[PDB]
Amino acid sequence: EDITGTWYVKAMVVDKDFPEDRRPRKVSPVKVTALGGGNLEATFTFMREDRCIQKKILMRKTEEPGKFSAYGGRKLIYLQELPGTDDYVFYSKDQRRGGLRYMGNLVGRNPNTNLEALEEFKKLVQHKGLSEEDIFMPLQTGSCVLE
């Protein structure tokens, strides 16, 4: 794999327990930087209603390539190539106080999206038990720290 630099979140999917109020309306580019020892850090912002939310996530190496962990292993994070296109899928499993949470994100180097890529995302998403009608596409923006 290769993982550091800028990524763009083009589509998003969430399990059916995920509250609608909780969905990102907007989202910045994701800057991924290495910290030595294989460990990474992703930085980004997104809008949840009128609220700008800032994230900075330590992603620790694991014995499987493409698989990472965050928040002490509370959350597991897989990066997989999305076949037939030049994008990847960012799949997360989060052992949250409130239950196990699944979440998928279509990510790519190029900020543009092809409909065929969204379709492969949907297909792959459905394979994993998640649903098409819970696929949403937040607005791509700069940081919301400006406003």
Short mmCIF file of N, CA and C in Angstrom, two decimals:
data_model
loop_
_atom_site.label_atom_id
_atom_site.label_comp_id
_atom_site.label_asym_id
_atom_site.label_seq_id
_atom_site.Cartn_x
_atom_site.Cartn_y
_atom_site.Cartn_z
N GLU A 1 0.84 -1.24 0.00
CA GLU A 1 0.00 0.00 0.00
C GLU A 1 0.85 1.27 0.00
N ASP A 2 0.19 2.39 -0.26
CA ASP A 2 0.75 3.72 0.02
C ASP A 2 -0.39 4.65 0.43
N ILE A 3 -0.16 5.38 1.51
CA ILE A 3 -1.22 5.87 2.38
C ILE A 3 -1.11 7.34 2.82
N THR A 4 0.10 7.88 2.90
CA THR A 4 0.32 9.26 3.38
C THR A 4 -0.02 10.29 2.31
N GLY A 5 -0.19 11.55 2.72
CA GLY A 5 -0.57 12.64 1.81
C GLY A 5 -2.05 13.00 1.92
N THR A 6 -2.57 13.65 0.89
CA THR A 6 -3.96 14.10 0.88
C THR A 6 -4.89 13.03 0.29
N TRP A 7 -6.02 12.82 0.96
CA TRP A 7 -7.11 11.99 0.46
C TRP A 7 -8.42 12.76 0.51
N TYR A 8 -9.34 12.38 -0.35
CA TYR A 8 -10.62 13.02 -0.44
C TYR A 8 -11.69 11.99 -0.17
N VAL A 9 -12.62 12.33 0.72
CA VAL A 9 -13.76 11.48 1.06
C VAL A 9 -14.92 11.79 0.13
N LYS A 10 -15.28 10.84 -0.71
CA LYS A 10 -16.23 11.08 -1.80
C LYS A 10 -17.61 10.54 -1.50
N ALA A 11 -17.68 9.51 -0.68
CA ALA A 11 -18.95 8.97 -0.27
C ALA A 11 -18.77 8.32 1.06
N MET A 12 -19.88 8.11 1.75
CA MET A 12 -19.88 7.65 3.12
C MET A 12 -21.09 6.73 3.34
N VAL A 13 -20.94 5.71 4.19
CA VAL A 13 -22.03 4.77 4.53
C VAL A 13 -21.84 4.39 5.97
N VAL A 14 -22.97 4.15 6.63
CA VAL A 14 -23.03 3.95 8.07
C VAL A 14 -24.04 2.85 8.39
N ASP A 15 -23.86 2.12 9.48
CA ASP A 15 -24.86 1.12 9.85
C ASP A 15 -26.17 1.80 10.22
N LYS A 16 -27.25 1.03 10.19
CA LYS A 16 -28.57 1.53 10.55
C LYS A 16 -28.80 2.05 11.97
N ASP A 17 -27.87 1.84 12.91
CA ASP A 17 -27.98 2.45 14.24
C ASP A 17 -27.47 3.88 14.27
N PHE A 18 -26.60 4.22 13.31
CA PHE A 18 -26.02 5.56 13.18
C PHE A 18 -27.10 6.63 13.10
N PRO A 19 -27.13 7.54 14.09
CA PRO A 19 -28.14 8.60 14.08
C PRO A 19 -27.98 9.57 12.91
N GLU A 20 -29.09 9.93 12.28
CA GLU A 20 -29.05 10.81 11.12
C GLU A 20 -28.47 12.18 11.48
N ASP A 21 -28.91 12.72 12.61
CA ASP A 21 -28.33 13.95 13.18
C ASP A 21 -26.79 13.92 13.18
N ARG A 22 -26.21 12.73 13.19
CA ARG A 22 -24.77 12.57 13.37
C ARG A 22 -23.95 12.61 12.07
N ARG A 23 -24.62 12.58 10.91
CA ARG A 23 -23.91 12.52 9.64
C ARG A 23 -23.19 13.81 9.24
N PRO A 24 -21.92 13.71 8.81
CA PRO A 24 -21.20 14.81 8.22
C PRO A 24 -21.93 15.44 7.02
N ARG A 25 -22.16 16.75 7.07
CA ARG A 25 -22.74 17.48 5.95
C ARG A 25 -21.64 17.82 4.99
N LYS A 26 -20.51 18.23 5.54
CA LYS A 26 -19.37 18.68 4.77
C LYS A 26 -18.16 17.97 5.31
N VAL A 27 -17.06 18.01 4.58
CA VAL A 27 -15.84 17.34 4.99
C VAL A 27 -14.64 17.91 4.24
N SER A 28 -13.53 18.09 4.95
CA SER A 28 -12.30 18.61 4.36
C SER A 28 -11.50 17.47 3.74
N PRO A 29 -10.39 17.80 3.05
CA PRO A 29 -9.43 16.75 2.69
C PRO A 29 -8.80 16.13 3.92
N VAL A 30 -8.40 14.88 3.81
CA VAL A 30 -7.75 14.17 4.89
C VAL A 30 -6.24 14.16 4.65
N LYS A 31 -5.49 14.73 5.59
CA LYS A 31 -4.03 14.71 5.50
C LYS A 31 -3.49 13.62 6.39
N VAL A 32 -2.84 12.64 5.76
CA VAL A 32 -2.26 11.50 6.45
C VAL A 32 -0.74 11.66 6.49
N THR A 33 -0.17 11.63 7.69
CA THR A 33 1.27 11.76 7.88
C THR A 33 1.81 10.58 8.67
N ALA A 34 3.02 10.12 8.32
CA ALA A 34 3.69 9.03 9.04
C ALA A 34 4.42 9.56 10.27
N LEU A 35 4.50 8.74 11.32
CA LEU A 35 5.13 9.14 12.58
C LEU A 35 6.27 8.19 12.97
N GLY A 36 6.78 7.44 12.01
CA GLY A 36 7.79 6.43 12.29
C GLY A 36 7.20 5.18 12.92
N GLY A 37 7.87 4.06 12.69
CA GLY A 37 7.40 2.75 13.15
C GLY A 37 6.15 2.27 12.44
N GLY A 38 5.86 2.85 11.27
CA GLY A 38 4.66 2.51 10.51
C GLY A 38 3.40 3.25 10.95
N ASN A 39 3.43 3.83 12.15
CA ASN A 39 2.26 4.52 12.71
C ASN A 39 1.93 5.77 11.93
N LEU A 40 0.64 6.04 11.83
CA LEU A 40 0.16 7.15 11.02
C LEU A 40 -0.74 8.08 11.82
N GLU A 41 -1.07 9.19 11.18
CA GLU A 41 -1.95 10.16 11.76
C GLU A 41 -2.74 10.78 10.65
N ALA A 42 -4.05 10.81 10.82
CA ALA A 42 -4.95 11.42 9.86
C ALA A 42 -5.55 12.66 10.50
N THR A 43 -5.58 13.76 9.75
CA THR A 43 -6.16 15.02 10.23
C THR A 43 -7.21 15.51 9.24
N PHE A 44 -8.37 15.90 9.74
CA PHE A 44 -9.45 16.41 8.88
C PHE A 44 -10.50 17.12 9.73
N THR A 45 -11.41 17.80 9.04
CA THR A 45 -12.53 18.47 9.69
C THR A 45 -13.80 18.12 8.95
N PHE A 46 -14.93 18.26 9.62
CA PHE A 46 -16.22 18.07 8.98
C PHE A 46 -17.30 18.80 9.74
N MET A 47 -18.41 19.07 9.06
CA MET A 47 -19.52 19.77 9.68
C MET A 47 -20.61 18.78 10.04
N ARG A 48 -21.05 18.84 11.27
CA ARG A 48 -22.14 18.04 11.75
C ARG A 48 -23.18 19.05 12.21
N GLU A 49 -24.19 19.27 11.37
CA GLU A 49 -25.16 20.37 11.53
C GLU A 49 -24.41 21.69 11.38
N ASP A 50 -24.56 22.62 12.32
CA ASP A 50 -23.82 23.88 12.27
C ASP A 50 -22.45 23.80 12.95
N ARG A 51 -22.04 22.62 13.40
CA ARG A 51 -20.86 22.46 14.24
C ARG A 51 -19.67 21.98 13.41
N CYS A 52 -18.58 22.74 13.42
CA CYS A 52 -17.32 22.30 12.81
C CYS A 52 -16.56 21.39 13.76
N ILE A 53 -16.25 20.17 13.32
CA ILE A 53 -15.57 19.23 14.19
C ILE A 53 -14.20 18.85 13.64
N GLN A 54 -13.21 18.92 14.52
CA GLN A 54 -11.82 18.69 14.18
C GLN A 54 -11.41 17.34 14.68
N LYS A 55 -10.69 16.59 13.85
CA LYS A 55 -10.23 15.25 14.19
C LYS A 55 -8.75 15.12 13.88
N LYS A 56 -8.08 14.31 14.67
CA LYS A 56 -6.65 14.06 14.52
C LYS A 56 -6.44 12.70 15.13
N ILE A 57 -6.28 11.70 14.27
CA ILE A 57 -6.38 10.32 14.70
C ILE A 57 -5.07 9.59 14.53
N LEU A 58 -4.54 9.12 15.65
CA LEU A 58 -3.41 8.23 15.65
C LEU A 58 -3.88 6.85 15.18
N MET A 59 -3.27 6.38 14.09
CA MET A 59 -3.57 5.08 13.49
C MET A 59 -2.35 4.18 13.65
N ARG A 60 -2.45 3.18 14.51
CA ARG A 60 -1.30 2.35 14.80
C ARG A 60 -1.18 1.17 13.83
N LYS A 61 0.06 0.81 13.53
CA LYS A 61 0.38 -0.33 12.68
C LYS A 61 -0.24 -1.61 13.27
N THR A 62 -0.48 -2.60 12.42
CA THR A 62 -0.78 -3.96 12.88
C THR A 62 0.01 -4.95 12.04
N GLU A 63 -0.12 -6.23 12.36
CA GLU A 63 0.59 -7.27 11.63
C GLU A 63 0.01 -7.54 10.24
N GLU A 64 -1.14 -6.96 9.92
CA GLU A 64 -1.69 -7.05 8.57
C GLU A 64 -1.59 -5.73 7.83
N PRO A 65 -1.05 -5.75 6.60
CA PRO A 65 -0.99 -4.51 5.83
C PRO A 65 -2.39 -4.05 5.44
N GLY A 66 -2.61 -2.74 5.49
CA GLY A 66 -3.93 -2.17 5.22
C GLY A 66 -4.83 -2.08 6.44
N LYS A 67 -4.51 -2.85 7.49
CA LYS A 67 -5.27 -2.84 8.74
C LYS A 67 -4.57 -2.01 9.83
N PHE A 68 -5.30 -1.07 10.42
CA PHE A 68 -4.79 -0.21 11.49
C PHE A 68 -5.75 -0.17 12.65
N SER A 69 -5.29 0.38 13.77
CA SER A 69 -6.11 0.54 14.96
C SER A 69 -5.97 1.95 15.51
N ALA A 70 -7.02 2.42 16.19
CA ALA A 70 -7.03 3.76 16.75
C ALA A 70 -7.74 3.77 18.08
N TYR A 71 -7.45 4.80 18.88
CA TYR A 71 -8.02 4.95 20.21
C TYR A 71 -7.80 3.69 21.05
N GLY A 72 -6.54 3.26 21.15
CA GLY A 72 -6.17 2.11 21.96
C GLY A 72 -6.70 0.77 21.48
N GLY A 73 -7.10 0.68 20.21
CA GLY A 73 -7.71 -0.54 19.68
C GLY A 73 -9.23 -0.60 19.83
N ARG A 74 -9.82 0.49 20.29
CA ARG A 74 -11.28 0.64 20.32
C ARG A 74 -11.84 0.54 18.89
N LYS A 75 -11.12 1.16 17.95
CA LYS A 75 -11.51 1.24 16.55
C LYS A 75 -10.49 0.51 15.66
N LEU A 76 -10.98 -0.32 14.74
CA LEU A 76 -10.11 -0.95 13.73
C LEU A 76 -10.45 -0.37 12.37
N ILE A 77 -9.42 -0.20 11.55
CA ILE A 77 -9.50 0.56 10.31
C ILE A 77 -8.78 -0.20 9.18
N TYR A 78 -9.52 -0.50 8.12
CA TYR A 78 -9.02 -1.24 6.96
C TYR A 78 -9.03 -0.33 5.76
N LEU A 79 -7.95 -0.35 4.99
CA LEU A 79 -7.90 0.35 3.71
C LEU A 79 -7.82 -0.73 2.66
N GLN A 80 -8.77 -0.72 1.74
CA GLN A 80 -8.84 -1.73 0.68
C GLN A 80 -8.96 -1.04 -0.67
N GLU A 81 -8.29 -1.60 -1.67
CA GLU A 81 -8.38 -1.10 -3.03
C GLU A 81 -9.81 -1.39 -3.51
N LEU A 82 -10.44 -0.41 -4.14
CA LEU A 82 -11.77 -0.60 -4.71
C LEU A 82 -11.56 -0.98 -6.18
N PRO A 83 -11.73 -2.27 -6.51
CA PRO A 83 -11.42 -2.75 -7.86
C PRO A 83 -12.19 -2.07 -9.00
N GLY A 84 -11.52 -1.91 -10.13
CA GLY A 84 -12.11 -1.30 -11.32
C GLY A 84 -12.03 0.20 -11.35
N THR A 85 -11.39 0.77 -10.34
CA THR A 85 -11.23 2.21 -10.27
C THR A 85 -9.95 2.49 -9.51
N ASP A 86 -9.68 3.78 -9.32
CA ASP A 86 -8.44 4.23 -8.71
C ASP A 86 -8.66 4.76 -7.29
N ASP A 87 -9.73 4.29 -6.65
CA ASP A 87 -10.07 4.70 -5.30
C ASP A 87 -9.95 3.52 -4.35
N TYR A 88 -10.06 3.83 -3.07
CA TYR A 88 -9.96 2.84 -2.01
C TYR A 88 -11.21 2.94 -1.15
N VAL A 89 -11.43 1.92 -0.33
CA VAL A 89 -12.47 1.96 0.69
C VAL A 89 -11.84 1.97 2.07
N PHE A 90 -12.34 2.86 2.93
CA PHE A 90 -11.88 3.00 4.29
C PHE A 90 -13.01 2.47 5.15
N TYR A 91 -12.81 1.28 5.68
CA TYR A 91 -13.83 0.56 6.43
C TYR A 91 -13.41 0.61 7.89
N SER A 92 -14.32 0.98 8.79
CA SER A 92 -13.98 1.03 10.21
C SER A 92 -14.98 0.24 11.05
N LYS A 93 -14.45 -0.44 12.06
CA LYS A 93 -15.26 -1.14 13.05
C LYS A 93 -14.89 -0.54 14.42
N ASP A 94 -15.88 0.06 15.10
CA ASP A 94 -15.64 0.81 16.35
C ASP A 94 -16.38 0.19 17.54
N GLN A 95 -15.62 -0.35 18.49
CA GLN A 95 -16.20 -0.91 19.71
C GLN A 95 -16.60 0.23 20.65
N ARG A 96 -17.78 0.80 20.42
CA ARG A 96 -18.19 2.03 21.10
C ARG A 96 -19.00 1.66 22.33
N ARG A 97 -18.87 2.44 23.39
CA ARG A 97 -19.72 2.30 24.58
C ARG A 97 -21.14 1.88 24.21
N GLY A 98 -21.68 2.50 23.16
CA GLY A 98 -23.06 2.27 22.72
C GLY A 98 -23.30 1.10 21.77
N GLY A 99 -22.25 0.34 21.47
CA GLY A 99 -22.33 -0.75 20.53
C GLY A 99 -21.28 -0.69 19.45
N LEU A 100 -21.21 -1.79 18.73
CA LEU A 100 -20.32 -1.92 17.60
C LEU A 100 -20.85 -1.03 16.48
N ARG A 101 -19.98 -0.20 15.92
CA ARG A 101 -20.36 0.67 14.81
C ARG A 101 -19.53 0.39 13.57
N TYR A 102 -20.20 0.07 12.46
CA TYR A 102 -19.56 -0.04 11.14
C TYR A 102 -19.73 1.24 10.35
N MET A 103 -18.74 1.55 9.53
CA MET A 103 -18.76 2.78 8.76
C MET A 103 -17.78 2.64 7.60
N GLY A 104 -18.21 3.06 6.42
CA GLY A 104 -17.41 2.94 5.22
C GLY A 104 -17.25 4.27 4.54
N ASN A 105 -16.07 4.52 3.98
CA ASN A 105 -15.83 5.76 3.27
C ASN A 105 -15.10 5.49 1.98
N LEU A 106 -15.62 6.05 0.90
CA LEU A 106 -14.97 6.01 -0.39
C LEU A 106 -13.95 7.11 -0.40
N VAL A 107 -12.70 6.75 -0.62
CA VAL A 107 -11.61 7.71 -0.57
C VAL A 107 -10.69 7.61 -1.79
N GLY A 108 -10.15 8.75 -2.23
CA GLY A 108 -9.24 8.77 -3.35
C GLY A 108 -8.31 9.96 -3.35
N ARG A 109 -7.27 9.86 -4.16
CA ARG A 109 -6.30 10.93 -4.27
C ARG A 109 -6.88 12.10 -5.04
N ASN A 110 -7.68 11.75 -6.03
CA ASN A 110 -8.26 12.71 -6.92
C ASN A 110 -9.58 13.09 -6.31
N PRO A 111 -9.89 14.39 -6.26
CA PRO A 111 -11.12 14.83 -5.59
C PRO A 111 -12.38 14.58 -6.41
N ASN A 112 -12.21 14.33 -7.70
CA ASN A 112 -13.34 14.06 -8.56
C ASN A 112 -13.84 12.65 -8.39
N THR A 113 -15.13 12.48 -8.64
CA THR A 113 -15.77 11.19 -8.56
C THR A 113 -16.41 10.79 -9.87
N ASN A 114 -16.33 9.50 -10.16
CA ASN A 114 -17.00 8.93 -11.30
C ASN A 114 -18.19 8.19 -10.72
N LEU A 115 -19.30 8.18 -11.44
CA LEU A 115 -20.48 7.44 -11.02
C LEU A 115 -20.16 5.96 -10.94
N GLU A 116 -19.29 5.46 -11.80
CA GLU A 116 -18.97 4.03 -11.82
C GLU A 116 -18.25 3.66 -10.52
N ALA A 117 -17.45 4.57 -9.99
CA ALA A 117 -16.79 4.34 -8.72
C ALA A 117 -17.78 4.31 -7.54
N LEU A 118 -18.78 5.19 -7.57
CA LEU A 118 -19.82 5.17 -6.55
C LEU A 118 -20.60 3.89 -6.59
N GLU A 119 -20.77 3.34 -7.78
CA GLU A 119 -21.49 2.10 -7.94
C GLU A 119 -20.74 0.89 -7.40
N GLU A 120 -19.43 0.85 -7.63
CA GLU A 120 -18.60 -0.22 -7.08
C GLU A 120 -18.59 -0.15 -5.55
N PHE A 121 -18.56 1.08 -5.03
CA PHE A 121 -18.66 1.32 -3.62
C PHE A 121 -19.95 0.75 -3.05
N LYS A 122 -21.06 1.04 -3.71
CA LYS A 122 -22.36 0.52 -3.31
C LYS A 122 -22.36 -1.00 -3.30
N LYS A 123 -21.93 -1.60 -4.41
CA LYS A 123 -21.81 -3.07 -4.52
C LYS A 123 -21.00 -3.67 -3.38
N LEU A 124 -19.84 -3.07 -3.10
CA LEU A 124 -18.97 -3.59 -2.06
C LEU A 124 -19.62 -3.40 -0.68
N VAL A 125 -20.23 -2.24 -0.50
CA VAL A 125 -20.95 -1.92 0.72
C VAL A 125 -22.04 -2.95 1.02
N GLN A 126 -22.82 -3.33 0.01
CA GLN A 126 -23.91 -4.30 0.17
C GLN A 126 -23.42 -5.70 0.49
N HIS A 127 -22.28 -6.07 -0.11
CA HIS A 127 -21.57 -7.33 0.17
C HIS A 127 -21.34 -7.48 1.67
N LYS A 128 -20.98 -6.38 2.32
CA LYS A 128 -20.68 -6.39 3.76
C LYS A 128 -21.88 -6.21 4.69
N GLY A 129 -23.11 -6.29 4.17
CA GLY A 129 -24.31 -6.20 5.00
C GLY A 129 -24.89 -4.80 5.20
N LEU A 130 -24.15 -3.77 4.81
CA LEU A 130 -24.66 -2.39 4.88
C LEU A 130 -25.62 -2.12 3.70
N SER A 131 -26.29 -0.97 3.72
CA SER A 131 -27.40 -0.69 2.79
C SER A 131 -27.17 0.53 1.89
N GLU A 132 -27.67 0.43 0.66
CA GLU A 132 -27.52 1.47 -0.37
C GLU A 132 -28.15 2.80 0.03
N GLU A 133 -29.29 2.72 0.68
CA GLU A 133 -30.09 3.88 1.03
C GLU A 133 -29.47 4.63 2.20
N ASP A 134 -28.52 4.00 2.88
CA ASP A 134 -27.73 4.69 3.89
C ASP A 134 -26.38 5.20 3.31
N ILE A 135 -26.28 5.33 1.98
CA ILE A 135 -25.08 5.91 1.37
C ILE A 135 -25.35 7.38 1.10
N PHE A 136 -24.47 8.23 1.58
CA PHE A 136 -24.64 9.67 1.46
C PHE A 136 -23.27 10.25 1.11
N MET A 137 -23.29 11.44 0.51
CA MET A 137 -22.09 12.02 -0.06
C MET A 137 -21.88 13.42 0.46
N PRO A 138 -21.02 13.55 1.47
CA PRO A 138 -20.91 14.89 2.02
C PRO A 138 -20.23 15.87 1.09
N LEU A 139 -20.49 17.16 1.28
CA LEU A 139 -19.90 18.20 0.47
C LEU A 139 -18.42 18.28 0.76
N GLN A 140 -17.59 18.29 -0.28
CA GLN A 140 -16.15 18.41 -0.08
C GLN A 140 -15.78 19.87 0.02
N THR A 141 -15.01 20.22 1.05
CA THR A 141 -14.72 21.62 1.35
C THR A 141 -13.30 21.76 1.86
N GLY A 142 -12.88 23.00 2.08
CA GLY A 142 -11.69 23.27 2.87
C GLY A 142 -12.05 23.07 4.33
N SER A 143 -11.09 23.34 5.21
CA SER A 143 -11.33 23.23 6.64
C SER A 143 -12.48 24.14 7.06
N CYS A 144 -13.25 23.70 8.04
CA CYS A 144 -14.29 24.55 8.63
C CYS A 144 -13.76 25.35 9.81
N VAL A 145 -12.45 25.44 9.95
CA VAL A 145 -11.88 26.19 11.06
C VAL A 145 -11.95 27.65 10.64
N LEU A 146 -11.87 27.91 9.33
CA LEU A 146 -12.09 29.27 8.83
C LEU A 146 -13.52 29.75 9.18
N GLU A 147 -14.54 29.01 8.75
CA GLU A 147 -15.93 29.21 9.23
C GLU A 147 -16.80 27.98 8.98
#
